[PDB]
């Protein structure tokens, strides 16, 4: 089974976007098709589904009347019209084949309309379990642009001290794009330093924090400064952390 998603990119909230999926190496018009998404890097989330003939459609509540699924059996393509996008929709969108080979068991008794064809009344239906998967197309939704970080101190205190050692750090919040360099005391302090990887928030802005462990006896006599540098916004900050 081959499936190739396409039509993803960067867009602001409120705008729309049309996803496409090219299916091959299986009788496309006999199987229902699913759309599912996966944010980096949370769990899977089912979005929508459509039957083999395209008469029955399904949508999750989060996406209802905002997203709409369709297909073109003539061109072996699946579509997902995404209107009024939100940052909550930021994810990698997979298309997936349904395992069930569907068939029409009961027809209507009048043509339509015009075109002279008979619509199916009753079918086996979608199973609905996802046999084959595509590589997925990535979709980002945020009005986030270049922006400098706000640096707040993570002060030491009893709750951050254990066994004579104290924990202190800096919070680098809401910046874009990537990356940021964080050092301590202009590079003089390297031991006990731990800079965690940033988190990509729903707003599309990054945030991280650098923490260092030091002797609590050095507090009051030794000065600690976190040197943050975010070159894209040309911001260079050295924040002194104190109790």
């Amino acid at each position: 089974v081959q499936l190739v998603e396409s039509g993803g990119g960067v867009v602001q909230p409120g705008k729309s976007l049309r996803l496409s999926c090219a299916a091959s190496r299986f009788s496309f018009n006999r199987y229902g098709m699913h759309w599912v998404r996966q944010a980096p890097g949370k769990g899977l989330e089912w979005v929508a589904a459509i039957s083999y003939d395209g008469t029955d459609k399904y949508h999750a509540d989060k996406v209802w009347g905002r997203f709409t699924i369709s297909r073109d059996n003539s061109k072996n393509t699946l579509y997902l019209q995404m209107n009024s996008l939100r940052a909550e929709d930021t994810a990698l969108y997979y298309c997936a084949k349904d395992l069930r080979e569907d068939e029409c068991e009961e027809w209507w008794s009048d043509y339509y309309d015009f075109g002279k064809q008979l619509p199916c009344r009753k079918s086996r239906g979608v199973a609905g379990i996802f046999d084959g998967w595509g590589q997925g197309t990535m979709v980002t939704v945020s009005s986030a642009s270049t922006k400098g970080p706000s640096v707040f101190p993570l002060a030491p205190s009893s709750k951050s001290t254990s066994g004579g050692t104290a924990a202190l750090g800096c919070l680098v919040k809401d910046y874009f794009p990537e990356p940021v360099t964080v050092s301590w005391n202009s590079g003089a302090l390297t031991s006990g330093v731990h800079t965690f990887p940033a988190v990509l928030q729903s707003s599309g802005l990054y945030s991280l924090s650098s923490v260092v462990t030091v002797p609590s006896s050095s507090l009051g006599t030794q000065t600690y400064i976190c040197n943050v540098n975010h070159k894209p916004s040309n911001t260079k900050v050295d924040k002194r952390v104190e109790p």
Binding site: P40, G41, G43, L44, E45, W46, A49, Y58, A60, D61, Y94, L99, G125, V126, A127, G128, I129, F130, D131, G132, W133, G134, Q135, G136, S150, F152, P153, L154, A155, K159, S160, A167, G169, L171, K173, H194, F196, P197, A198, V199, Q201, S202, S207, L208, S209, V211
Partner: protein
């Protein structure tokens, strides 16, 4: 609601099981299927309709089910099994969910399990005058790399305003992660405490802070 353990691990060649619990609205009356998502690639079908094996699904994998809980079973655990596993339930013709699992990360142990060391920072006074509140949970030195972070106000579970990173590999071949809880100064000084609870391999570490 398909709750499912974040981490499952064992020595090489050992048998392993993954649980998949929920309510009666999902599998109280329906079917459950399993999927394997390996790092850097798309999910594959592993097992469908409780206990059916595709052709290219090794016989070491087997599925089971009872009540509102499904169970995947893996034998002869090996490197090829290291991946993310999801259970799923499509009772769509009526209701939703309609949902996938959490889910589980399989790992072949190269060293003893290491439970995480957690440190929780409260909002800085500098931030609170900017009319913002942000708690910071720092999770470090745990193995295998998969944890569950749950935030608490008093004892209420809170899920709104939480941002958690995926685990990253440290230089010492262990893992690290961080969780942020965005809050308003009102909510912050309203409750008598806020807690950061981290579950890992059945064990749980907890830290708390307050104004």
């Amino acid at each position: 609601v398909l709750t499912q353990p974040p981490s499952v691990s064992a020595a090489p060649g050992q048998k392993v099981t993954i649980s998949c619990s929920g309510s009666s609205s999902n599998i109280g009356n329906n079917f459950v299927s399993w999927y394997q998502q390996r790092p850097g690639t798309a999910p594959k079908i592993l097992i469908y309709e409780n206990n059916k094996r595709p052709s290219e699904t090794p016989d070491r994998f087997s599925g089971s089910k009872s009540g509102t809980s499904a169970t995947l079973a893996i034998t002869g655990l090996q490197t090829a099994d290291e991946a993310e596993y999801y259970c799923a339930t499509w009772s769509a013709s009526l209701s939703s969910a309609r949902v996938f699992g959490t889910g589980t990360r399989i790992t072949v142990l190269g060293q003893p399990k290491a439970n995480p060391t957690v440190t929780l920072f409260p909002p800085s006074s500098e931030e609170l005058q900017a009319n913002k509140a942000t708690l910071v949970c720092l999770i470090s030195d745990f193995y295998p790399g998969a944890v569950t972070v749950a935030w608490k106000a008093d004892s209420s579970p809170v899920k709104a305003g939480v941002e958690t990173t995926t685990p990253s590999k440290q230089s010492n071949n262990k893992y690290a992660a961080s969780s942020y809880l965005s809050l308003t100064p009102e909510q912050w000084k309203s409750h008598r405490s806020y807690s950061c609870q981290v579950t890992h391999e059945g064990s749980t570490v907890e830290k708390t802070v307050a104004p």
